[PDB]
Amino acid sequence: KSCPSVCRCDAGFIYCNDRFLTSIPTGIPEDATTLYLQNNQINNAGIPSDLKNLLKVERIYLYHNSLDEFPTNLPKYVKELHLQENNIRTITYDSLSKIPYLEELHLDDNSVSAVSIEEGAFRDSNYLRLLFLSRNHLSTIPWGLPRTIEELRLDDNRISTISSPSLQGLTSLKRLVLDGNLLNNHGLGDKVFFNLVNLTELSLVRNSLTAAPVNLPGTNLRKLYLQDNHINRVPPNAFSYLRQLYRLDMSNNNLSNLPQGIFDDLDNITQLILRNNPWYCGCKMKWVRDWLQSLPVKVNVRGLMCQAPEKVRGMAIKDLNA
Amino acid sequence: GDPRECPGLLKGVYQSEHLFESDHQSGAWCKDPLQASDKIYYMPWTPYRTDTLTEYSSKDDFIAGRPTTTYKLPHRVDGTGFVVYDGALFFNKERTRNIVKFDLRTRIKSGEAIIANANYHDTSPYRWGGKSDIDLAVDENGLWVIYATEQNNGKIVISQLNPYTLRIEGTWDTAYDKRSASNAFMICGILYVVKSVYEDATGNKIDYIYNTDQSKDSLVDVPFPNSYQYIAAVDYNPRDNLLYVWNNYHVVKYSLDFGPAAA
Ligand SMILES: *[C@@H]1O[C@H](CO)[C@@H](O)[C@H](O)[C@H]1NC(C)=O
Ligand SMILES: *[C@@H]1O[C@H](CO)[C@@H](O)[C@H](O)[C@H]1NC(C)=O
Ligand code: NA
Ligand code: NA
Ligand code: NA
Structure with a gap:
């Protein structure tokens, strides 16, 4: 020795x-x-x-x-x-x-x-299973990442675009963190996440997202973090086929409407966090009350309260008559 | 019930309460001894991802899994060593030798301090690892930090910490190799060090004490309960004189028996 x-x-x-x-x-x-x-x-x-x-x-x-x-x-x-x-x-x-x-x-x-x-x-x-590249000089997600990667952290970089080939064939990836980059809905490539069959968690927190992304993988997705964006709207298919999704979080976003039926495919949505959102309460939101009254006991939903109009600002959505 | 009055010298440890089985093998939990209400604070250990503190308003809510609130912390945490003290969380910031103080009423970081020369980030953890290098402790004397340095050859060092200025008030080098310990805790300014079996040294006991009033240390043998063989946290509470333990997914409390105090 x-x-x-x-x-x-x-x-x-x-x-x-x-x-x-x-x-x-x-x-x-x-x-x-x-x-x-x-x-x-x-x-x-x-x-x-x-x-x-x-x-x-x-x-x-x-x-x-x-x-x-x-x-x-x-x-x-x-x-x-x-x-x-x-x-x-x-x-x-x-x-x-x-x-x-x-x-x-x-x-x-x-x-x-x-x-x-x-x-x-x-x-x-x-x-290689775990790759942490937080706080590097990345502008894009590198191509040729090992097919065995299970956790990829790219947070606090300057990522602007994601190419479909870069995530293509990362079938083992279950956790992807893209927090604090320069991503727009424009920057996300078409179906970039679609083939991430094993993906369990997708974090896009503190990007510049204006609308919930679409073509997210449903086979395995259980957690989707979109908090601290500026998402004004939810495209009708933003949560399509997300049959395993366990927690979804769009806190701290500019949500005023939720079009009817966007949660229709959320078979397993156990924790749905919608706090810190400017909920306009009008005709289009009547379904919410009923959907929350018919909401199953196991499901925990939070954060839904009216901000506009002034008359019912601050009043819980699941209680208002009209 | 008086968190500032010494109960004596620890003579015996007994399983007292089994609350439930967490979904995480390791973690820590505790109550705030300077808080009048019966709040419980909970932090499971998740490598590379420990960034929240969960608060429950009762034991029933805790067992049911019904949080009052969750605090998102401003940095990730290394290890199971956090405490809550007069409404502030204190924790080891991931991959640093620093303690962060985070005020719970305002949810803002109110302080940070360097623990001079402490080893960190799986360099001198307790025996199971988990970046448990730096462990905070509250007792009748105040706030402490339990760690190791290379100046002390990897053996446990104790510092007393000012809870508002975060400045070290006193430092003591012990003779006990920190990585050999399962965990440790303070009572009346005395460090008690636990040795125990891990599922994957056949004795489960407190085999060493260091008395900071005297700067004197000794071997002891106090049997220490270890039903599940994976102790991840041991936290003493001076208000109720219990130990708050996390053992192989099990969240449990241990009662204590005391004899006449040491100097
Ligand atoms: C995807 O995850 C499953 C989990 O059951 C695992 O068995 C499988 O091996 C993973 N995919 C690949 C290509 O390894
Ligand atoms: C979750 O989705 C599956 C289909 O993938 C379905 O069988 C199951 O019933 C859903 N969960 C609940 C709690 O209904
Ligand atoms: Na006492
Ligand atoms: Na501790
Ligand atoms: Na401890």
């Missing part, structure tokens, strides 16, 4: 964190399982070639370091790579291929863009 004189080693956990390191010290034992290298000044030239031979390392924590390209010379069997808060710009096939067993990649707070990711970079990442 050797240990770098600068580090602390305990039963496979290698603590080299917060130690003003510009390179990884010599002397990490070959039974190392977890490398704590966070809160250092390590750059790519600081990662020695010998590191690749630490065959038992499954997790590397390299967040808050000085990497400006995807790290190379990594232990071959590493499964979890935490790279948040580096200056990483570019991802290449050579770097990704060298760690074929990677399951979890956290790249939050880096400078990755679509053009920076080499074409086919992920072709050999046949085990």
